[PDB]
Write a protein that binds this ligand. Structure first.
Ligand SMILES: N=C(N)NCCC1CCN(C(=O)[C@H](Cc2cccc(C(=N)N)c2)NS(=O)(=O)c2ccc3ccccc3c2)CC1
Length: 241
């Protein structure tokens, strides 16, 4: 996260960290139930040197705050039993960049581990609404990741403007969130993480999945996120959630 600040410990109990066997933090995820997490599909694509699509190659850390303190009290470690990438995911356009990750064993709800609420299919996160992006990703484009979870406030951008800023790259499954001036934005390593939106009664709903961006925090290049409401039924059908 670029232009963010240290989050308070336990401030985002739904934020999860996904480590690949011997590679440390690779992507973020969100806890949505005792057994399921939501993340970005592009994080689980095999490459010639490593099988990122193999659930046994991952470890999820829930209730984590500092990457250098993965054993701290309250931090839960879990293995993945399965990775369900959206069938329509497109590695080239990044359309349908969303995945469901089944925990090998249930998360234990605590003050540091708690699911984020999921929005109904018909709900719309309005342009201009303040949203929170969190993650251990880079704090600067071409920089390095954060040890302490970072948080940043950004805003939903009008879909038409989004399409115009990134021509031939924005599908209806995507949504721009951030600022045209840049400054605050997600970045490498934040992919898979959730957008947290404070709703009418203070409860937090997931407004999207960190997916991609042209650089990080650049002017006129807000981050592109996978929308959530559009996948409510898909999540329910695949996880029972
Ligand atoms: N085979 C593979 N391992 N492929 C990995 C592809 C890529 C997917 C998403 N990523 C990004 O979009 C980054 C960083 C980023 C991540 C999330 C949000 C934002 C944001 N600005 N809000 C920025 N953006 S970039 O313009 O620097 C870039 C794009 C595509 C690339 C392809 C290959 C190598 C480097 C790349 C960098 C990181 C990695």
């Amino acid at each position: 996260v670029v232009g963010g600040t240290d989050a308070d410990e336990g401030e985002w109990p739904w934020q999860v960290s996904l480590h690949a066997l011997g590679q440390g933090h690779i992507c973020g995820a969100s806890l949505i139930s005792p057994n399921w997490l939501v993340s970005a599909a592009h994080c689980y694509i095999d490459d010639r040197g490593f099988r990122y699509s193999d659930p046994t190659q991952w470890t999820a850390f829930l209730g984590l705050h500092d990457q250098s303190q993965r054993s701290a009290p309250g931090v839960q470690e879990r293995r993945l039993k399965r990775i369900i990438s959206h069938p329509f995911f497109n590695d080239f356009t990044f359309d349908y960049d969303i995945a469901l990750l089944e925990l090998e064993k249930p998360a234990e709800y605590s003050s540091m581990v708690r699911p984020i609420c999921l929005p109904d299919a018909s709900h719309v996160f309005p342009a201009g609404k303040a949203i929170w992006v969190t993650g251990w990703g880079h704090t600067q484009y071409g920089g390095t990741g954060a040890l302490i979870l970072q948080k940043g406030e950004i805003r939903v951008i009008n879909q038409t403007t989004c399409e115009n800023l990134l021509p031939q790259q924005i599908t209806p499954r995507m949504m721009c969130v951030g600022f045209l001036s840049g400054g605050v934005d997600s970045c490498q390593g934040d992919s898979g993480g959730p957008l947290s939106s404070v709703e009418a009664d203070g409860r937090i709903f997931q407004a999207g999945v960190v997916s991609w961006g042209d650089g990080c925090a650049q002017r006129n290049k807000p981050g592109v996120y996978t929308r959530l409401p559009l996948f409510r039924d898909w999540i329910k059908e695949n996880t029972g959630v």
